[PDB]
Symmetry: D2
Subunit: 341 residues, 4 copies
């Protein structure tokens, strides 16, 4: 009979309905259709196709799908972002990072669970670009707050694992005296960083290198940074190379630059903390973030584990802060301002 | 200031939270962890790992993620499906089809929108296995209803595009006189069909061929089916080969078997019908289904377009029915019972 | 142990969380706080209190509650409507009708289920005001569409069960030549109608009477309307007085005004129609609407039952239409344009 | 044109859809229909009507409404609780308290905001019965944990503001040696307490008095309790009588019983704490709870304010605990075990 089955089916596949919506919103941003709709206000599929070099029948299908979900409006003149569509604008970075960067990673979990199957891969170009977009809201203001509390003023800034260079673009625009250097090991992210710096008119003040963090510190250069930012990069080194390697890397930084101010941003691993995981942002963001870190070659640890690593590396904590409670009130994103002990 | 940003962020990325949940539920089913939890009732990560050949730290991460979402319970003895987890059991086919089969397809939409980029690919093995799982609820009962209304009793059944052979397994178990033949062009789906038929003890009554529908009808065989089922296959032929090819294929069927009863199941294309698209199942299932058909080499048309194709092919409609309103009340899934005019 | 109980509790009481939010949004509109926030942009509790004659500690509690739900933003200068709060503006009529008018009705259902307990009461003033607010979107445009299909021109309009007189105000602003008369039996609704007509500068063109529909038609007056509108009033007469009374009332209308055009708006009773009840607006609005109509002295019947009543009353159907699919695509709200047979 | 209005309307009035569902679930429990469906498994409206003395057409309306929402299933034999309906069972206390006890309170907020309008009323019988139902999960296990940490053994227990006496029934069933006395000032709650104690076969061990807490301590009796429980009652006395009255009341307790162990359960007022208010249970339960406490004659204060009151009353804190993180992980429900300083 299957009595009452349909009502249970509609609820049972609600995650699938939102799964397709999340990928469709990601493409709406990533293909620049979102930016096109903002600029044109109303655009026919023909006009959007001519501008972005797309095929009309496929574009009309995406637009009809989004209109059925209320993201777009359709009039005789074409399609436009609805109020709900416009409201998505600030969240671009989260879609780019988690869908663009990590969709393949989540899809690989079944095969990667097998004994000896290795780490799930990701699209590190989208992870870096998306992460930088998110950092505009949480990590960049946290880094700015920590920088203002250091005894010295920043004049030469080094950002290792810089993604598309958004921290350097924001700090340099706000603080005109700064000269900066970013290192990004992902080739795609490195190319986006060189492009962003050029587009912002900062190429005379900011250089980007295609390099990993450890290899950059082992390389030869005359730049003498007074600040180094490690935004969510130490846990990647921790997973990739191990704890002794992280301690040695931090020791190398203060051996080479004894007067440097280090700003480290990390996520506290509270995956197994029942109360922390009930916060709406811990469930929407941190729960999938913790899951992907169990399948990739990256290792999140607790606030106390980081403090112990800093002590072992011969670093003193100047101050520790979490993000503004207006953007992320979980207390899981922590910034540390450190100096040589 | 970003005043009130976090509350908007939690709602803004709700599709991403459910996107990861949908992929995680898909793996819970696909890896056989769901079946293991049903059998064991409670299982430690060590016990599940030993049984399925998995790695404990990755499995513990998936289990902790699912426990945070309420799908699993954790006690000192291990993990178990919660009431919410158990409730997911009937929906396996939808997760396997839409996530397993079509996740890559949705992820390809951005690149496939470009002029000349071609059709998005899919994992046709998962599409066929998942589709057969869904058909247990909607299309198999619809096919059974249409078969009972035909003038002749079924003795030799041909199922073209059979997936894992679930229609043949269900009809043969319920109707012991039937001999059946299935054709599935996807190698993976064909192998699952041979395995399912063997596991059900039906290899003496059901044969499966690795073949497409048109090529199967052009092949040489002595089998004289009195019923042919085309469950969601004509729209694939329509997209792949065009309307004249579909008409010629239908004409070939009644030329070769003039007394045959044809049962065709298709989805009515009402993507642009405002009222139809507000039904909860049209939004959860048919909206993403219509979207994927704009990006793959398959073409959905309306009920009237199908009736016109049948008239052109020299077929008469015996009866037309939609699915039981207890499982799918949209009126979009339509079954046609046809014979030679 | 209550293992995993909290996650089930948060979902289990989700209807209670939204129950309080719905009442709070209703008060935000009804107390004029919503209009105050629109005008001031930002207001401290002190400023809102002084303007509306409210108590600061209670107002701060409502504001903090709404801020936690994201309806309001709080800055050093005070509270403001968020983008989410602004987006609620068009829905005022639904909150005023279903919460203001019918909260007491839903709350009485437990006691009214008892044998001989009678009909649940409602706040008919809020039902009329709220219903008129809703009608701006659905029923007024439907009435306008039906009026344009009638032969001749409207010069004298009679609206029986007019609520706050919104149809008369809207029709008088679009058709500056018409004179109008409204009858509303609820004293509160009648007083709101006299006030709305005066505020719109229409008192020289529109008269309102405190009267029921049947009693108005039995009264003495020289007004010769060429159009009579019965917007969701016949089913109230049907419940209150019975089917013979409705037929007699309709007969009386065309006996007194043989050349009149009648426009009747009614809701088709499809409470027991599985497919109809899966539409998102059927669940959000029509399911509670049907429930209220089982506990109040009002009777909804099917489209065919209305057509039979019109035939028995000696009326002929000129045309029948449903609402625009841009506002209500259920097909449940039906407008009939009738004349004497 | 109202382009795309319907999709915005369905989301805009989602709180109203859940508002009606919450009231309907409350009645399903309160009228004993939920218990009837559990016992019968399947019941026709006629059978439920005959058993509970209800009217068939109204009951059929409630049942059809619930079936459309998936709470009930309908077969030829009648209606039954679906899996979703069965899953509601543990949450009865929350529906009885917040809907039964406080629906009138939320509905009065608009009028009670006016200067000099006084405190909103509530149905204290439903608040006490509902609160006791909730306490089975959170506060009773917390009280049991605190009792086990006190020196000696409980033999005489006094519960002031006992509601329906559920703590006394549960403590008497787990500790068969204890005698108990409860005081409840609400007449309805007092009568439910006398009935519950009798139904549990505990009338020879447990006495209930119709009295407030302060008046009970001022009355004459020979009972010498070694434990007194004040479960969510001190904040009611605080609002009703003021801080000096609460301090005097606590002083009176240890003056009369110098060796007594006091167990006080209170909710920490973190209404204005951004991070606390993002927890799913803080939004679902504590946000409406805080709102009700701004409109009723009850005052919630912070953990530090309670500790200060205890110090001023001459009490010393033995231990302080929050609820099990399996049921309530907000840290907002706090239990204090106190003794004379
Ligand atoms: C999570 S993203 C953070 C980007 C940026 N720092 C921010 O805070 O938004 C981590 C970045 O570090 C890069 N990365 C990974 N391993 C690294 C390594 N060993 N050295 C330097 N960067 C690394 C990744 O490619 C990626 O761009
Ligand atoms: C949507 S699934 C439906 C499976 C099954 N008939 C059912 O109703 O559940 C479509 C199936 O047809 C197969 N198919 C695709 N093109 C085909 C063709 N030209 N001939 C035969 N089968 C085809 C696919 O590989 C897939 O297994
Ligand atoms: C659902 S409201 C509809 C108001 C308005 N016609 C509209 O379409 O928005 C029904 C109105 O009819 C009024 N009413 C109820 N019984 C009536 C009667 N016997 N005669 C006239 N009006 C009646 C109610 O007081 C209420 O104002
Ligand atoms: C929130 S209920 C808590 C009931 C029970 N103690 C529990 O923990 O579930 C508060 C109860 O205290 C009662 N109450 C209110 N004012 C009181 C007073 N001054 N003295 C005693 N009880 C009071 C109310 O009637 C109600 O039954
Ligand atoms: Mg990382
Ligand atoms: Mg297909
Ligand atoms: Mg009505
Ligand atoms: Mg209280
Ligand atoms: Na981040
Ligand atoms: Na890892
Ligand atoms: Na299907
Ligand atoms: Na296609
Ligand atoms: Na209406
Ligand atoms: Na009625
Ligand atoms: Na409580
Ligand atoms: Na209060």
């Amino acid at each position: 009979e299957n009595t009452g089955f349909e009502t249970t089916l509609i609820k049972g596949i609600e995650p699938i309905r939102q799964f397709v919506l999340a990928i469709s919103i990601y493409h709406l941003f990533d293909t620049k259709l979102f930016s096109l709709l903002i600029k044109h206000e109303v655009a026919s599929p023909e006009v959007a196709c001519n501008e972005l070099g797309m095929e009309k029948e496929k574009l009309l299908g995406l637009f009809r799908y989004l209109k059925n979900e209320g993201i777009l409006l359709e009039t005789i003149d074409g399609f436009s972002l609805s109020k709900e569509g416009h409201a998505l604008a600030p969240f671009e970075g989260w879609y780019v990072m988690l869908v663009g960067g990590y969709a393949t990673t989540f899809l690989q979990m079944g095969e990667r669970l097998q004994e000896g199957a290795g780490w799930a891969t990701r699209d590190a170009t989208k992870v870096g670009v998306g992460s930088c977009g998110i950092s505009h809201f949480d990590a960049i203001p946290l880094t700015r707050s920590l920088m203002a509390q250091a005894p010295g003023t920043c004049t030469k800034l080094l950002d290792l694992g810089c993604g598309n260079g958004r921290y350097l673009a924001e700090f340099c625009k706000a603080l005109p005296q700064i000269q900066a250097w970013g290192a990004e090991p992902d080739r795609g992210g490195f190319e986006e960083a060189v492009d962003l710096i050029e587009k912002e008119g900062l190429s005379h003040r900011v250089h980007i290198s295609h390099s990993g963090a450890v290899e950059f510190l082992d390389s030869d250069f005359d730049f003498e940074p007074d600040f180094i930012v490690l935004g969510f990069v130490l846990h990647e080194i921790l997973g990739q190379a191990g704890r002794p390697a992280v301690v040695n890397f931090l020791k190398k930084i203060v051996h080479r630059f004894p007067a440097i101010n280090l700003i480290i941003i990390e996520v506290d691993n509270q995956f197994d903390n029942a109360g922390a995981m009930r916060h709406g942002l811990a469930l929407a963001y941190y729960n999938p973030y913790y899951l992907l870190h169990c399948f990739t070659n990256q290792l999140l640890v607790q606030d106390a584990d980081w403090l112990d690593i800093f002590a072992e590396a011969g670093l003193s904590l100047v101050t520790r802060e979490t993000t503004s409670d207006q953007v992320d009130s979980t207390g899981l994103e922590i910034g540390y301002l450190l100096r040589r002990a």
